Symmetry: C4
Subunit: 191 residues, 4 copies
């Protein structure tokens, strides 16, 4: 077990974390975090039998609401929390049958970091697209990414493009036709 298994094997759960209004202008690559969030949302719709979409909101009333730029799937499980780690009672039971987790959002050193560490304690295989991850400061971000990259072999940091291709082992995959449509989309900020 070194890469994401084919989408048919086990269950994967996507996790859009704290992509809220208050952070939109305070992060540089926020737009690329929104792009990846949509990329995974459309992917989720293509294979909804094996995938789940979870959206987290941190202290909503006080400077926080999921950015309208992201069109969430109709089967999206949106919860609201005050704990920095996105592991709350509500999502804990939602991952009782899920073997994999795609955590993407903000902040790399804060919410993301404590979420993935908790997910690693639950024996879950976490896969993080650097593509859709950010922070307000570069030093705070860098130090967090270098750390999670040493949490192998159950934690891996790649890109949104690679992740999609990992789940579809073959190009003659029945769903590839629909998946390849997503890879052609151009992210706001060049990669």
């Amino acid at each position: 077990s070194r890469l994401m298994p084919h989408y048919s094997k086990g269950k994967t759960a996507f996790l859009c974390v704290d992509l809220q209004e208050a952070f939109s202008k305070r992060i540089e690559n926020f737009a690329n975090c929104v792009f990846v969030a949509n990329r995974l949302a459309r992917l989720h719709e293509l294979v909804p039998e094996n995938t789940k979409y979870i959206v987290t909101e941190h202290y909503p009333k006080g400077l926080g609401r999921i950015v309208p730029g992201i069109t969430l799937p109709q089967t999206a499980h949106l919860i609201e929390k005050t704990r920095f780690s996105c592991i709350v009672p509500q999502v804990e039971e939602l991952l009782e049958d899920v073997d994999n987790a795609v955590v993407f959002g903000i902040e790399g050193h804060a919410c993301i970091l404590q979420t993935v560490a908790d997910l690693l304690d639950m024996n879950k295989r976490v896969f993080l697209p650097k593509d859709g991850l950010g922070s307000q400061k570069k030093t705070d971000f860098k130090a967090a990414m270098k750390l999670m990259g040493s949490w192998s072999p159950n934690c891996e940091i790649t890109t949104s493009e690679s992740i999609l291709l990992q789940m579809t082992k073959d190009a003659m995959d029945p769903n590839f036709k629909k998946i390849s449509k997503l890879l052609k989309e151009e992210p706001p900020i060049p990669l």
Copy 2:
């Protein structure tokens, strides 16, 4: 055990190392090491039951005295040593009940490096904020940080901001109100 536990669990000891006058102008990010030193000092005051503040002075009389820019807590244990590693008889017994250590200061390749290696031999969980760490030369510093980043799983290098948030798992924490005051402070050199 992959991140700092909540401040209520066990004992943590902050370690301000060799932030003296002789180094003030010889280091580029010395001011940011002073900022973090103050950040951890105020944090220590907020939860003094589970935290300890230790300040080290290396060969004081000969070019050395803790910089007046840092306002030390009243419960600070300041000791003076000649050994590069900040593990001397005086601090060895002071860590008989402490499970965690936040080492921050100067120099990354010298005093810091030999301190954390000794702390790892004592089974202690060391957490280092790159935020408040420096060196006179970049190459000396870089080579030291890449090394300590391979001393997992008991050694972790993040930032001052992340570290504070690790100790406070929830934003509805009784102390968060007082802790969040520190995160709003702006470091002299942009991160």
Copy 3:
């Protein structure tokens, strides 16, 4: 076992992956991937008893054909596949007696990544020359290389020059005279 053994010990198989026309202008260091491909091709000819040369073609008819800039050996095993990972039934049986693999080509995050992960599952010792590896985007590439560099001790990422020297432990090697001819060649893009 920490580096490539002398070419006489065991069997090594070179793997030129998906270096096709459609990618020629979409990658920056494509020319250096072609250079290394030729470097390994001539090397293969010098010691053909212990080495094998394998070329992969991904969906040929639809934008794909091995670039004419690469002169393949006469003993080259060229196969065509639709699976992103270059592990297909045809090459699986071709590696029944091979202990080492030199994987070089494109893309670092896509085909390469899933190929080396599968090769690691087969207990094979993979050695990757960063020299002859690329991607359309830097972020996609970087994130892939940082990952495979944590797949030790059976996966190693060096350069084409180092790899050749690893196989020839001594400069008084009977074949060194012919091998040293290859190292003198200048890659299109400076290293």
Copy 4:
């Protein structure tokens, strides 16, 4: 065992590798490799009871002779070889009582890389000062250093300054007075 022990414990052997005339103008940081070579040479003289100095010459007659800029100690063991790895019968028996090795020279991806890998097979603790290491190309060098940095816990890459301070745990060391003289010297190329 995470850092260099005090010079009194066990035996350490310095290794100046292939710092010859033919490479002087083909490497950028060759002068800094010469500086470190002299730094370790003077250090060797200060504690000659526990240290050994070994100089390697690769194919001398044909473009090779130790650079006159380096003043070798009178107790230096200079040998000549044709094997890229600096492990030849002559030095193999010279390390029968030595527990540590400081390998510094050129090339990072070639001679150095194969030397340290062989030294790791001999159970020796290798410590490499990035300070005194180089290559003709940056990509060849970088890929080699990232690799050896994953060969822990018996291989460590720091700087010449840190290494000297590791061996002298205390500043009140009987020899510190003589050692501190070396740290004050300015390397040709700024670090």
